[PDB]
Design an enzyme around this catalytic site. Structure first.
Site, PDB file in Angstrom:
ATOM      1  N   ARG A 257      21.566 -92.006  55.181  1.00  0.00           N
ATOM      2  CA  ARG A 257      21.839 -92.685  56.448  1.00  0.00           C
ATOM      3  C   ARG A 257      23.199 -92.410  57.042  1.00  0.00           C
ATOM      4  NH1 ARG A 257      18.507 -97.007  53.874  1.00  0.00           N
ATOM      5  NH2 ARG A 257      17.775 -96.933  56.054  1.00  0.00           N
TER       6      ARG A 257
ATOM      7  N   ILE B  83      26.366 -91.134  58.674  1.00  0.00           N
ATOM      8  CA  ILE B  83      26.999 -89.850  58.811  1.00  0.00           C
ATOM      9  C   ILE B  83      26.290 -88.753  57.996  1.00  0.00           C
ATOM     10  CG2 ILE B  83      29.157 -88.575  58.197  1.00  0.00           C
ATOM     11  CD1 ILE B  83      30.747 -91.003  59.175  1.00  0.00           C
TER      12      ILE B  83
ATOM     13  N   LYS C  53      21.767 -92.757  46.421  1.00  0.00           N
ATOM     14  CA  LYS C  53      21.404 -93.762  45.441  1.00  0.00           C
ATOM     15  C   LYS C  53      20.314 -94.701  46.018  1.00  0.00           C
ATOM     16  CE  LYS C  53      25.782 -95.875  45.654  1.00  0.00           C
ATOM     17  NZ  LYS C  53      26.191 -95.965  47.097  1.00  0.00           N
TER      18      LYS C  53
ATOM     19  N   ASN D 229      29.766 -86.345  50.908  1.00  0.00           N
ATOM     20  CA  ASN D 229      29.853 -87.422  51.885  1.00  0.00           C
ATOM     21  C   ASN D 229      29.649 -88.813  51.259  1.00  0.00           C
ATOM     22  OD1 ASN D 229      29.415 -88.816  54.815  1.00  0.00           O
ATOM     23  ND2 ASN D 229      27.509 -89.151  53.662  1.00  0.00           N
TER      24      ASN D 229
ATOM     25  N   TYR E 144      40.866 -97.969  50.240  1.00  0.00           N
ATOM     26  CA  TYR E 144      40.071 -96.981  50.930  1.00  0.00           C
ATOM     27  C   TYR E 144      40.892 -95.824  51.418  1.00  0.00           C
ATOM     28  CZ  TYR E 144      36.937 -94.816  54.177  1.00  0.00           C
ATOM     29  OH  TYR E 144      36.138 -93.923  54.853  1.00  0.00           O
TER      30      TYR E 144
ATOM     31  N   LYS F  62      40.894 -91.715  50.377  1.00  0.00           N
ATOM     32  CA  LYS F  62      40.673 -90.611  51.332  1.00  0.00           C
ATOM     33  C   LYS F  62      41.866 -89.662  51.411  1.00  0.00           C
ATOM     34  CE  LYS F  62      36.523 -91.649  52.395  1.00  0.00           C
ATOM     35  NZ  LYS F  62      35.492 -90.611  52.345  1.00  0.00           N
TER      36      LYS F  62
ATOM     37  N   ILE G 123      33.188 -93.599  63.939  1.00  0.00           N
ATOM     38  CA  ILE G 123      31.866 -93.077  64.139  1.00  0.00           C
ATOM     39  C   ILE G 123      30.935 -94.266  64.155  1.00  0.00           C
ATOM     40  CG2 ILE G 123      30.072 -91.548  63.280  1.00  0.00           C
ATOM     41  CD1 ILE G 123      32.825 -90.137  64.008  1.00  0.00           C
TER      42      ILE G 123
ATOM     43  N   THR H 144      27.861 -96.160  63.480  1.00  0.00           N
ATOM     44  CA  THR H 144      26.758 -96.192  62.512  1.00  0.00           C
ATOM     45  C   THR H 144      26.335 -97.641  62.352  1.00  0.00           C
ATOM     46  OG1 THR H 144      27.821 -96.774  60.351  1.00  0.00           O
ATOM     47  CG2 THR H 144      28.058 -94.475  61.101  1.00  0.00           C
TER      48      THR H 144
END
EC number: 1.1.1.122
Lengths: 255, 250, 250, 247
Positions: D17, D19, D39, D87, D152, D156, D185, D187
């Protein structure tokens, strides 16, 4: 009063705002400071105030002025240890359609080619002393700015030139670094704001562009310069950001 | 053949080398390409070879040349979708002492103000098409190089300007990006190499100057440009490095 | 003498090398310095030579050591003005095939989570003093390095985390910055060089790896740290490079 | 379907799902065989039904045996591996630093960093044979930071940095290793009204990005960026540009 004792420093655009802050910082470090500005009044008041400082009227776009500045410095003090290229002009806000090539060229003279010229002429003396060069660029050189295409281009050029020159002069032990201030509260900032319909709102907006919630001080840029000159001895080709984190995180970039 | 079909692209400095790689790439995308250059011999040969490409003699340092180019492009094709500002000169190596302000000004005219002038004049039409600008800068603008102070300065100015302009043009949905190449092979390069004291050594140096172990191709710069024009619709003010890893800790 | 007088500074990994250079630099600023390390032999020696320095045995990977350290610092000195996170290990060179996830996890534990844990526990006190955080990262985090994937990853994380934290702490007026050293000389380096097949060539290689033609000194990293702590009041989330020009087009 | 990456085999983790799904579609449209690795059964299974150029293999990248099997299954079914797109990854909800935990941070490094490390490691022998490439999906916030996201952001920054180190390691083998750094983005993850708006206006373009746009960037890196290695390709709508509202 001892961190840069016995050293000789040239600060262009040194008569007011950021330049003056740098001038004061260096004088407090015990350095001899040559204030170089095209404006008589500002630099002459500053020279009266600060015995560690001397005012030489000079337009960095005029090569003879620059040639004289350098000769006078060596003639009066016998050495040159640091050149701080702070001379530069931020135009009022202009949409790209309303810029001209002639205006852009003029601004390159003011913001880039003066830096180039003084640096070239000073470099023989900075080699003898193992001195250093500090260019005052701008954050907007790195991230851009709205309504400032010519200005932004000139400061990207300065920051890039700093790196190239660092590489060329490293064999001679001459370090070349830049400082990239963000929003620094100066009378300059203020005159610009006064042109807006709601200047107070524009000053606020400028404060809030930093996570720290304030604008910077010329003294803070001055401290950064004294550091680069006097203690950053393994730093060359760096861009030292004095921005209050303005480049960090998400913000409000459209409407 | 389809990726940028029915679009009109202007490529400055398109007559040979990197510029020709960009022109070819866009032609293969289906675009109509206006080769804008003072290099007629390159430009007319490309135009003769590629039906999708046309040559218009134009010096970007000359404002009236650039007005005529844009005007001809619109008059002839009715639209303008993409401007690639690739015009620019890398001088030979020069120590800082042996540069002049005059030389520096001349290089700014070509590398920076030419990009400015054409973009300015093209922008009213790019807005209409929701087109884009692609400026060809250089890795050395970002990290420096030895014996190239004016050049590095001009390219740092182009990259910065890219970002400024992206900001200003964003409300009109006009995207403004740059590609920063590293060592790209050209027929000129190959011809210069052969004049070296030791051409083989020189060639090896050039190939081993980036982790990938070869030089870039004009086509690779072109592919990057076509991507930016045709598929990078959320990209603006980016600097796309086409360098073979040259800036990495290497 | 005088420019960070009256202030309390914790330096992790302060017992020797770069850390000891930072400790000394702060001591010379007039600050009270708490050397925090698992290296007692280095830490106790420094403490005995420098009156302004004190050693507390502490493993930053152990949360209760860290709680104890902070609590001892406050109870003893009543305040905390600056935290320098310098604890961290650079493994020997390893190809990617020769790394393990387990190794990588342990290295994250030391280089990243140790910095996280201490900073977290100090922050309530730093807020009170309007203190600041200085994390010692590494240039390789920015541009990469061969044969050091885990190490590069951990330093990339530390530099990123510095910015994150700068944002979060900005409303309290707590500044968070990092110094990214390149090749810095230490007694350990010197001792390793001596084991090389050709120590002279090895030494030269290290000196010529940056344009300034020498390696950096611990004192220089310390100077940069004192500047960030004491005079960089409009600087937050910056990465101060102490590399001798290593990242330049060189 | 498409010709650009025809004959190639691509693994996209977190591909079921958002991206990852946009990246999967982009590659299937380029004519690639795509292994969707996720997963979550439901998302990837629906996507494999939709897209004949695509195959779903249930896999948790934190579990080394799952990853070992993923790779072996790819090679056994299609005989080759040309691109790995890392990703898989999680953005936690916003958290002040004081309200983060070490254990939480470790968990997030497993999810966002070590899964990438593990798959890439296992895939690399095959990527060498094919002269394939690695594409890691990092984030802009790795580079400029973000408020209320210390863990987070750290993860990254680690991914972006690791990308560069690996690029250097693998370049002698002709394996390029690049990353894409998306900004905002849109989503279902992203998905109050005021906050959506503030997210749109964080880009000078005045909108958020689409998974398809990140997909396009990946296909470009895989199929035509042949002199690009160790780059950070920003798909951010100019979010990093200019002055904003940061206090």
């Amino acid at each position: 009063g001892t961190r840069y004792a016995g050293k000789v420093v040239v600060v262009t655009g040194g008569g007011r705002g950021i330049g003056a802050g740098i001038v004061r910082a260096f004088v407090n470090s015990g350095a001899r400071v040559v204030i170089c500005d095209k404006d008589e009044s500002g630099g002459r008041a500053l020279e009266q105030e600060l015995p560690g400082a001397v005012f030489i009227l000079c337009d960095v776009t005029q090569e003879d002025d620059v040639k004289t500045l350098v000769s006078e410095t060596i003639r009066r003090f016998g050495r040159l240890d640091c050149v701080v290229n702070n001379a530069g002009h931020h135009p009022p806000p202009q949409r790209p359609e309303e810029t001209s090539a002639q205006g852009f060229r003029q601004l390159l003279e003011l913001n880039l080619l003066g830096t180039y010229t003084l640096t070239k002429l000073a470099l023989p003396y900075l080699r003898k002393s193992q001195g250093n060069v500090i260019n005052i660029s701008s954050l907007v050189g790195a991230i851009g700015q709205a309504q400032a295409v010519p200005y932004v281009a000139t400061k990207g050029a300065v920051t890039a030139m700093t790196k190239a020159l660092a590489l060329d002069e490293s064999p001679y032990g001459v370090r070349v670094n830049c400082i990239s201030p963000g929003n620094i509260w100066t009378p300059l900032w203020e005159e610009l704001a006064a042109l807006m319909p709601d200047p107070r709102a524009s000053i606020r907006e400028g404060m809030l562009a930093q996570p720290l919630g304030r604008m910077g001080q010329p003294a803070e840029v001055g401290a950064a310069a004294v550091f680069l000159a006097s203690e950053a001895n393994f730093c060359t080709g760096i861009e030292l950001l004095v921005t209050g984190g303005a480049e960090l995180g998400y913000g409000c970039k459209a409407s």
